[PDB]
Amino acid sequence: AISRTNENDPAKHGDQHEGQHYNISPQDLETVFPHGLPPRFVMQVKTFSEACLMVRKPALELLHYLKNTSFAYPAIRYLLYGEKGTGKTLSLCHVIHFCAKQDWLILHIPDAHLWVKNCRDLLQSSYNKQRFDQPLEASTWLKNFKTTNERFLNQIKVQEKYVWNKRESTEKGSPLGEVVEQGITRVRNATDAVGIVLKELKRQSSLGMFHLLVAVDGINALWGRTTLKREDKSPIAPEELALVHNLRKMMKNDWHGGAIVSALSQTGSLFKPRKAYLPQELLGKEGFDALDPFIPILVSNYNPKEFESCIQYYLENNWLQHEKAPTEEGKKELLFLSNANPSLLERHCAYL
């Protein structure tokens, strides 16, 4: 088992673990990642009966930054970028698993692209008649947010009276969980429940009640375009969506007591060419201006050690069933055909 590390605690991974797969327990999978993992990594987890993530230099660098983070200074924006299928989402997952173990409050958005396309039931927000609500997109997120942070929802207590309807209001000092519960029961108030949560999480984190991680995958969606239309077939802007408008406030570094970690993604983007991967091309002028200043972190293809370790993990799981895959010629052909790209390599190995 040269492709495995016995270190299952992400808070003690270092340069000596580069290229080695560490295991995430089922409890951590169901709590930390109800929604985080890529769709094709979840099938692997089901097939292998285990979730093992390789330790890579991007994640190690981002963990080194988060260990030496000053919680008095304003939150620092970290942006993971790289070519398609290089493993930036799974690096983000490594960092989220690190932060969840140290009792940070995790605000994880699995894919911000889903909020700007293919919404069937779009409403007009009563709080602000110029914005639109997405009850199914917001309630779906609230359930998994509650799942991840179920411990804190009772400790954290609201600081303002929130009036859902003339009959119903959340009183000052009530636990945040009630707000979350109100979003799950009545979907009409789901979108307004997300915003309130963010407003509280930004504020209380500043007081120092908890450390907050804002982990947004596919962040280039926020300052882009949408494919959502009005009834008169007119376009809708990303800032006209209440869910998108409230999530932009959490990308600004006007708060302390946490860090902002983000990952770009051309996959699922709107109006971007297939080969666009750099920060400015995907973000746009508006997005780059919003995130600037930020620390960009590059995710690349496997190096030879990483590639050999990935194939040894697959061989240890008996996932390469072709007789020539164990041989040297098979590995050289896999290397050429994927060019050490994690996603292409995994897809090729899926049917071998």
Binding site: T47, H322, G330, E333, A350, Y351
Partner: protein
């Protein structure tokens, strides 16, 4: 044809050229020396010296294309292979100790055995005389029965009774049924073998 008659088909086999000159018999040596004087056609897009190349799966993929869409056909083929692999892994994990020895997890082995279990040995060839196209039993050539297994599998999977179930899912299920000698394709082989046993009057016409 744009190729002249003198052009010969290429030989893509890679280990063929690595045989030591010592092993080469006089006839094979003469063949090799002859090959130097001939023109060789450009290798077609498709077969390659790869170690993962499988001519049977290539032929099945070609038989699945519609309108020259090879990317889609190959995508369907790889999806079917992955579905068979995942199903076998699921069945292996849930099995007890002594049943894990008899569960196959190589999708290529399953595909080849499934197609082999569907090959018919004998078929009927019509012959013309008197206005009556006479149906005589005939021992099918190897190529013919190999083609028929694949054609029966594909036609079975293209049936319209299977509503909105995607082609990889239907095809993996049919392949795993034929692996265990079950399903409608095995019955189609059986209903040809019995329907050729029902017509053994003209069983000795050896000049079809």
């Amino acid at each position: 044809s744009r190729y002249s008659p003198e052009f010969k088909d290429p030989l893509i086999d890679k280990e063929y050229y690595r045989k030591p000159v010592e092993e080469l018999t006089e006839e094979e040596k003469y063949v090799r020396e002859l090959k130097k004087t001939q023109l060789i056609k450009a290798a077609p897009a498709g077969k390659t010296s790869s170690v993962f190349e499988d001519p049977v799966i290539s032929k099945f993929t070609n038989m699945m294309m519609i309108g020259g869409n090879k990317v889609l056909a190959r995508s369907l083929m790889i999806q079917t292979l992955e579905a068979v692999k995942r199903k076998q892994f699921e069945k292996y994990h849930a099995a007890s100790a002594e049943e894990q020895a008899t569960i196959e997890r190589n999708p290529y082995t399953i595909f080849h055995q499934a197609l082999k279990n569907c090959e018919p040995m004998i078929g009927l060839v019509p012959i013309l005389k008197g206005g009556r196209f006479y149906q005589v039993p005939v021992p099918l050539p190897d190529r013919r029965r190999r083609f028929l297994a694949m054609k029966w599998m594909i036609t079975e999977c293209r049936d319209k009774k299977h509503q909105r179930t995607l082609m990889p899912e239907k095809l993996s299920h049919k392949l795993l049924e034929a692996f265990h000698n079950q399903g409608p394709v095995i019955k189609r082989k059986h209903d040809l073998h019995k329907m050729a046993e029902a017509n053994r009057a003209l069983a000795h016409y050896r000049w079809w």
